[PDB]
RNA sequence: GACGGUGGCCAUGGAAGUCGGUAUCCGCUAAGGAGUGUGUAACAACUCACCUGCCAAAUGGACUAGCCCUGAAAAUGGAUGA
């Protein structure tokens, strides 16, 4: 084929001329690796402050929308764009913009080849019984899955916790588990006012 | 322990149907045969398709050789009362009778 | 089958504990409730569940309940079905309290 | 009509000694050494220093160009393999009529015994240099390691070919020994 | 709607439509056979309760379990709320019959139900509902300015109001 | 006990000289396996009958073994169904009807379906329901309407 | 275990497509016979499973 | 990444994009057909259209027409004359 993704462009020309950069605060956010199903529910105060906007073909064309403002073109001698990264325009204060996305956040399920931190409890419900499942749970510390009047092969409380994070060893034991609600929020690429740039943050500073 | 469907099934199209599935799979297919009443379906079984011009206009095929005529093909003759049909009439000739009917 | 059932003065219900209650038997029996017979219940093929396929006797009990329920339904077509329920609720007439069985 | 062919360069890591006596390679690394023959198509093939071999030929056609690309690719694999040994794991599939797979460790010969009813002894001598070993993964799998990727793979294929049913349906049996984990290496 | 009583003794949520008043269907194991853990429906007339005058046909139901209890809950669906206001002839004896009939105003009743469908999409519950409902159905036109699943009306190509509440 | 649909089958002699044997055999069967129409006929010389569709087949096995050493050939163009008249015309003497000048059949028209077109579709193509036979010594009209299902039952 | 193996087997058995001329099996995403007897048909049908 | 309304209305009382009939809309987004198959009781799950991350300069296609190939099989041993 021959095009852009796999078809020629007629709406990505409009992403540069989508708005004027009237808003004084922007931030590069990594909300693409988290899924679109959960991404639309957390964003209610996230849109109305400037919205989640702009394409990633036009992220290089973004430079003509910084010359209008007092902002320099690059953020801190680098645009910081080597990832699925989108711009979120904000009207919230200099301290509030540091935690604008993390105020309402949620993660996606853990994939093959990565563990990810699991802070929230795992779901429950009737899923039969399996004796071979107990042999795989011997690697883990808790070897008990049947709880209460119901019967099932996974617990109602998270056994996978922070501290057990690794590259690729205990990640195979999560494929034995039948459900993956791995919460680690969303990820700031950088924080930025209108001239000065900062590192990713969760606090007011 | 059982799961139930109450699906209708014509009496003619089962001719050792319940016997096959029962033996093939006992327990996971136990058909209990229970009558109810005769369902009426939109189809008109009749001998010989008359005039194909009509058909060419097209609103299904009926009063002809059909899915419905499978049941009414040649069930008349179980040896039968006659070879096919023997009947005599005196309703013919409208002029001699002098009728408008 | 129907013809057979009304000739014979007695009866006996053979139902499977690994294949459920037989539908054929049920169908004919319902006609046979209009005739005077003495059908004794005997639940068969627990030899399949307990020994041959080899499942634990805890499961057997569980299985049996379903069978019993099925039988209750059968009973309830043209005969009464409340004594059975009562029995299920509390086994036999005497010994009403579990503490007293000690 | 007749077009010049670009050189295809390849970096060589410092683990190994690619020598090239008259357009014909030998690549000596940790796992041992692999030689190979080239100058099929009259190509030129040079060393710049000792971290860069480059193949080329400065006139020709699509046909020649393709060949150039091929040779380089082939050598890259060899380089990879003679430094880090290759692993082609073949898993076998039967437990209705159970399967008996055996391995002569000395001569490096797999011997497949009983599958699809057979009482025969099917012995397949592995190609030069490569080896095998029995591995307990899930009461399954023969792992075939070797440094010549071309040869090992070929051997595996041969085995696969030999462990199937040459008369009647190809799906009545899906059984036999087939490749499972391939393009696999090691550093342990 | 959210659940009326929260599932206790581990969470239990099951999904079969249970359409119409008639029938004694209940959801405990739609992906497996009949039994889940134990027999517990609860009640055969739950369908009726859920769908008295909301539909005889493709009527969705969020079945749940509170360890041997069901409090009757529906999703406030895009089909169920519009068909609630429709006349009893098209809500009764249409179980084995097609229905593509209903062009009356349903403007008021869907506004309150818009929060129950979704609670966070960054849109107006009385403004964006005139686009999302009304011009997305063949059994519900609302005002006759809109068009049933078309590109003639609902997106302001004939309408004048579209994001504003009517 | 006979069947509810009245399931029949064309029992025939394989050989012509074996006809008598066949005839005899049915009677014999009657005592052992209950109910066959060997005598007192609604359709044909003789037909085998049973309590159902599945049992019809079974009883034909029995009419080969034993008895008068009988052997049969069979002709089953499946089990017979029945018809219903839910639409008369508006032509000649019929008071209660649902005929018009566009709906001729229950679905579509008789013209669009095909066949059975003696007269036009604008007065229904189901007409000529009154007749005369012996020069007005036995004139009659007839009306076939749907009988209620409960009543039928 | 078994099912995974079965899939693998299929991949080296069923998946390959054939040419309506030889009936010779090329591979599961093919566009040609790549044989000179066919005449290089490029008119392939997939191989029919035990389901069909 | 491949969504919300949404399980679209129907058939169903299971068919929840995908046994299947007809309409085939709107939100929101970087993008996402009331859905391309695989799969499943139908779903779920997976993939496709659709988009984007990286790598980094060409890509895609429908045809025409030279030579070649396929089409292109037959009778002593054989013919660009060798």
PDB file of C-alpha atoms in Angstrom, chain D residues 4-147:
ATOM      1  CA  UNK D   4      25.940  -0.961 -10.650  1.00  0.00           C
ATOM      2  CA  UNK D   5      25.519  -2.848  -7.352  1.00  0.00           C
ATOM      3  CA  UNK D   6      25.938  -1.171  -3.979  1.00  0.00           C
ATOM      4  CA  UNK D   7      28.305  -2.643  -1.415  1.00  0.00           C
ATOM      5  CA  UNK D   8      26.681  -4.270   1.604  1.00  0.00           C
ATOM      6  CA  UNK D   9      28.736  -3.656   4.736  1.00  0.00           C
ATOM      7  CA  UNK D  10      28.695  -5.709   7.932  1.00  0.00           C
ATOM      8  CA  UNK D  11      30.224  -4.938  11.307  1.00  0.00           C
ATOM      9  CA  UNK D  12      32.091  -7.828  12.926  1.00  0.00           C
ATOM     10  CA  UNK D  13      32.381  -8.002  16.723  1.00  0.00           C
ATOM     11  CA  UNK D  14      35.852  -8.355  18.257  1.00  0.00           C
ATOM     12  CA  UNK D  15      35.120 -11.863  19.620  1.00  0.00           C
ATOM     13  CA  UNK D  16      35.943 -13.396  16.214  1.00  0.00           C
ATOM     14  CA  UNK D  17      38.495 -13.538  13.360  1.00  0.00           C
ATOM     15  CA  UNK D  18      36.948 -13.362   9.925  1.00  0.00           C
ATOM     16  CA  UNK D  19      39.697 -14.308   7.494  1.00  0.00           C
ATOM     17  CA  UNK D  20      39.012 -14.410   3.772  1.00  0.00           C
ATOM     18  CA  UNK D  21      41.469 -16.406   1.623  1.00  0.00           C
ATOM     19  CA  UNK D  22      40.462 -15.763  -1.986  1.00  0.00           C
ATOM     20  CA  UNK D  23      36.770 -14.928  -1.616  1.00  0.00           C
ATOM     21  CA  UNK D  24      36.106 -17.842   0.830  1.00  0.00           C
ATOM     22  CA  UNK D  25      35.276 -17.279   4.532  1.00  0.00           C
ATOM     23  CA  UNK D  26      36.379 -18.753   7.866  1.00  0.00           C
ATOM     24  CA  UNK D  27      34.926 -17.247  11.041  1.00  0.00           C
ATOM     25  CA  UNK D  28      36.637 -18.335  14.304  1.00  0.00           C
ATOM     26  CA  UNK D  29      34.731 -17.441  17.493  1.00  0.00           C
ATOM     27  CA  UNK D  30      34.190 -18.859  21.020  1.00  0.00           C
ATOM     28  CA  UNK D  31      32.052 -21.881  19.957  1.00  0.00           C
ATOM     29  CA  UNK D  32      34.703 -22.925  17.424  1.00  0.00           C
ATOM     30  CA  UNK D  33      34.921 -22.165  13.705  1.00  0.00           C
ATOM     31  CA  UNK D  34      32.868 -22.276  10.495  1.00  0.00           C
ATOM     32  CA  UNK D  35      34.334 -22.055   7.009  1.00  0.00           C
ATOM     33  CA  UNK D  36      32.295 -21.431   3.880  1.00  0.00           C
ATOM     34  CA  UNK D  37      32.732 -21.095   0.122  1.00  0.00           C
ATOM     35  CA  UNK D  38      31.875 -18.025  -1.977  1.00  0.00           C
ATOM     36  CA  UNK D  39      32.657 -16.594  -5.440  1.00  0.00           C
ATOM     37  CA  UNK D  40      29.631 -18.185  -7.038  1.00  0.00           C
ATOM     38  CA  UNK D  41      28.651 -15.023  -8.924  1.00  0.00           C
ATOM     39  CA  UNK D  42      32.172 -13.482  -9.264  1.00  0.00           C
ATOM     40  CA  UNK D  43      31.590 -11.074  -6.340  1.00  0.00           C
ATOM     41  CA  UNK D  44      34.266  -9.055  -4.561  1.00  0.00           C
ATOM     42  CA  UNK D  45      34.568  -9.354  -0.832  1.00  0.00           C
ATOM     43  CA  UNK D  46      36.977  -7.330   1.326  1.00  0.00           C
ATOM     44  CA  UNK D  47      38.092  -6.672   4.890  1.00  0.00           C
ATOM     45  CA  UNK D  48      38.556  -3.107   6.126  1.00  0.00           C
ATOM     46  CA  UNK D  49      40.603  -3.306   9.355  1.00  0.00           C
ATOM     47  CA  UNK D  50      39.270  -6.224  11.390  1.00  0.00           C
ATOM     48  CA  UNK D  51      35.786  -5.063  12.370  1.00  0.00           C
ATOM     49  CA  UNK D  52      34.253  -4.694   8.886  1.00  0.00           C
ATOM     50  CA  UNK D  53      33.802  -7.141   6.018  1.00  0.00           C
ATOM     51  CA  UNK D  54      32.123  -5.813   2.887  1.00  0.00           C
ATOM     52  CA  UNK D  55      30.743  -7.578  -0.191  1.00  0.00           C
ATOM     53  CA  UNK D  56      30.178  -5.921  -3.560  1.00  0.00           C
ATOM     54  CA  UNK D  57      30.518  -6.147  -7.307  1.00  0.00           C
ATOM     55  CA  UNK D  58      30.544  -2.957  -9.238  1.00  0.00           C
ATOM     56  CA  UNK D  59      28.442  -3.928 -12.247  1.00  0.00           C
ATOM     57  CA  UNK D  60      25.654  -6.389 -12.961  1.00  0.00           C
ATOM     58  CA  UNK D  61      21.928  -6.849 -12.492  1.00  0.00           C
ATOM     59  CA  UNK D  62      19.139  -7.403  -9.962  1.00  0.00           C
ATOM     60  CA  UNK D  63      20.239 -11.036  -9.947  1.00  0.00           C
ATOM     61  CA  UNK D  64      23.762 -10.133  -8.852  1.00  0.00           C
ATOM     62  CA  UNK D  65      22.499  -7.577  -6.334  1.00  0.00           C
ATOM     63  CA  UNK D  66      20.318 -10.204  -4.666  1.00  0.00           C
ATOM     64  CA  UNK D  67      23.280 -12.570  -4.448  1.00  0.00           C
ATOM     65  CA  UNK D  68      25.375  -9.887  -2.747  1.00  0.00           C
ATOM     66  CA  UNK D  69      22.653  -9.333  -0.166  1.00  0.00           C
ATOM     67  CA  UNK D  70      22.375 -13.072   0.419  1.00  0.00           C
ATOM     68  CA  UNK D  71      26.060 -13.768   1.025  1.00  0.00           C
ATOM     69  CA  UNK D  72      26.405 -10.979   3.582  1.00  0.00           C
ATOM     70  CA  UNK D  73      23.311 -12.216   5.406  1.00  0.00           C
ATOM     71  CA  UNK D  74      24.696 -15.753   5.448  1.00  0.00           C
ATOM     72  CA  UNK D  75      27.968 -14.615   6.910  1.00  0.00           C
ATOM     73  CA  UNK D  76      26.233 -12.515   9.569  1.00  0.00           C
ATOM     74  CA  UNK D  77      24.367 -15.579  10.816  1.00  0.00           C
ATOM     75  CA  UNK D  78      27.606 -17.560  10.920  1.00  0.00           C
ATOM     76  CA  UNK D  79      29.282 -14.786  12.893  1.00  0.00           C
ATOM     77  CA  UNK D  80      26.389 -14.739  15.354  1.00  0.00           C
ATOM     78  CA  UNK D  81      26.387 -18.516  15.693  1.00  0.00           C
ATOM     79  CA  UNK D  82      30.066 -19.288  16.068  1.00  0.00           C
ATOM     80  CA  UNK D  83      30.203 -16.738  18.949  1.00  0.00           C
ATOM     81  CA  UNK D  84      26.788 -17.591  20.460  1.00  0.00           C
ATOM     82  CA  UNK D  85      25.614 -21.144  19.672  1.00  0.00           C
ATOM     83  CA  UNK D  86      22.240 -21.618  17.923  1.00  0.00           C
ATOM     84  CA  UNK D  87      19.379 -23.637  19.355  1.00  0.00           C
ATOM     85  CA  UNK D  88      16.538 -25.245  17.350  1.00  0.00           C
ATOM     86  CA  UNK D  89      14.105 -27.022  19.671  1.00  0.00           C
ATOM     87  CA  UNK D  90      11.754 -29.604  18.144  1.00  0.00           C
ATOM     88  CA  UNK D  91       8.661 -30.688  20.089  1.00  0.00           C
ATOM     89  CA  UNK D  92       6.823 -33.877  19.271  1.00  0.00           C
ATOM     90  CA  UNK D  93       3.110 -34.532  19.416  1.00  0.00           C
ATOM     91  CA  UNK D  94       1.503 -37.830  20.467  1.00  0.00           C
ATOM     92  CA  UNK D  95      -0.087 -39.274  23.640  1.00  0.00           C
ATOM     93  CA  UNK D  96      -3.038 -41.348  22.240  1.00  0.00           C
ATOM     94  CA  UNK D  97      -0.595 -43.808  20.889  1.00  0.00           C
ATOM     95  CA  UNK D  98       2.327 -42.583  23.108  1.00  0.00           C
ATOM     96  CA  UNK D  99       5.657 -41.637  21.485  1.00  0.00           C
ATOM     97  CA  UNK D 100       9.168 -42.982  22.218  1.00  0.00           C
ATOM     98  CA  UNK D 101      12.042 -40.714  21.233  1.00  0.00           C
ATOM     99  CA  UNK D 102      15.651 -41.735  21.945  1.00  0.00           C
ATOM    100  CA  UNK D 103      19.093 -40.159  21.488  1.00  0.00           C
ATOM    101  CA  UNK D 104      22.587 -41.627  20.963  1.00  0.00           C
ATOM    102  CA  UNK D 105      24.750 -39.039  22.733  1.00  0.00           C
ATOM    103  CA  UNK D 106      28.107 -40.337  21.403  1.00  0.00           C
ATOM    104  CA  UNK D 107      27.615 -40.277  17.626  1.00  0.00           C
ATOM    105  CA  UNK D 108      25.022 -37.453  17.884  1.00  0.00           C
ATOM    106  CA  UNK D 109      22.121 -39.457  16.475  1.00  0.00           C
ATOM    107  CA  UNK D 110      18.445 -39.202  17.296  1.00  0.00           C
ATOM    108  CA  UNK D 111      16.561 -42.501  17.094  1.00  0.00           C
ATOM    109  CA  UNK D 112      12.770 -42.230  16.960  1.00  0.00           C
ATOM    110  CA  UNK D 113      11.171 -45.503  18.027  1.00  0.00           C
ATOM    111  CA  UNK D 114       7.384 -45.863  18.225  1.00  0.00           C
ATOM    112  CA  UNK D 115       4.873 -43.522  16.627  1.00  0.00           C
ATOM    113  CA  UNK D 116       1.626 -44.144  14.745  1.00  0.00           C
ATOM    114  CA  UNK D 117       1.798 -47.831  15.681  1.00  0.00           C
ATOM    115  CA  UNK D 118       5.230 -48.416  14.062  1.00  0.00           C
ATOM    116  CA  UNK D 119       7.621 -51.056  15.451  1.00  0.00           C
ATOM    117  CA  UNK D 120      10.548 -49.798  13.298  1.00  0.00           C
ATOM    118  CA  UNK D 121      13.775 -48.101  14.345  1.00  0.00           C
ATOM    119  CA  UNK D 122      14.148 -44.724  12.635  1.00  0.00           C
ATOM    120  CA  UNK D 123      17.719 -43.463  13.103  1.00  0.00           C
ATOM    121  CA  UNK D 124      18.691 -40.068  11.684  1.00  0.00           C
ATOM    122  CA  UNK D 125      22.363 -39.155  11.810  1.00  0.00           C
ATOM    123  CA  UNK D 126      22.780 -35.436  12.467  1.00  0.00           C
ATOM    124  CA  UNK D 127      24.846 -33.306  10.101  1.00  0.00           C
ATOM    125  CA  UNK D 128      28.488 -32.369  10.694  1.00  0.00           C
ATOM    126  CA  UNK D 129      29.309 -30.379  13.843  1.00  0.00           C
ATOM    127  CA  UNK D 130      25.831 -30.134  15.362  1.00  0.00           C
ATOM    128  CA  UNK D 131      24.529 -31.979  18.398  1.00  0.00           C
ATOM    129  CA  UNK D 132      21.358 -32.719  20.347  1.00  0.00           C
ATOM    130  CA  UNK D 133      20.261 -33.409  23.887  1.00  0.00           C
ATOM    131  CA  UNK D 134      17.255 -34.715  25.776  1.00  0.00           C
ATOM    132  CA  UNK D 135      15.623 -32.109  28.021  1.00  0.00           C
ATOM    133  CA  UNK D 136      12.861 -32.344  30.626  1.00  0.00           C
ATOM    134  CA  UNK D 137      10.494 -29.446  29.796  1.00  0.00           C
ATOM    135  CA  UNK D 138       7.099 -31.170  30.147  1.00  0.00           C
ATOM    136  CA  UNK D 139       8.057 -34.799  29.386  1.00  0.00           C
ATOM    137  CA  UNK D 140       8.552 -33.519  25.823  1.00  0.00           C
ATOM    138  CA  UNK D 141      11.043 -31.931  23.395  1.00  0.00           C
ATOM    139  CA  UNK D 142      14.449 -32.736  21.879  1.00  0.00           C
ATOM    140  CA  UNK D 143      16.758 -29.704  21.885  1.00  0.00           C
ATOM    141  CA  UNK D 144      19.207 -29.477  18.991  1.00  0.00           C
ATOM    142  CA  UNK D 145      22.027 -26.991  19.526  1.00  0.00           C
ATOM    143  CA  UNK D 146      24.688 -26.152  16.943  1.00  0.00           C
ATOM    144  CA  UNK D 147      26.705 -23.280  15.522  1.00  0.00           C
TER     145      UNK D 147
END
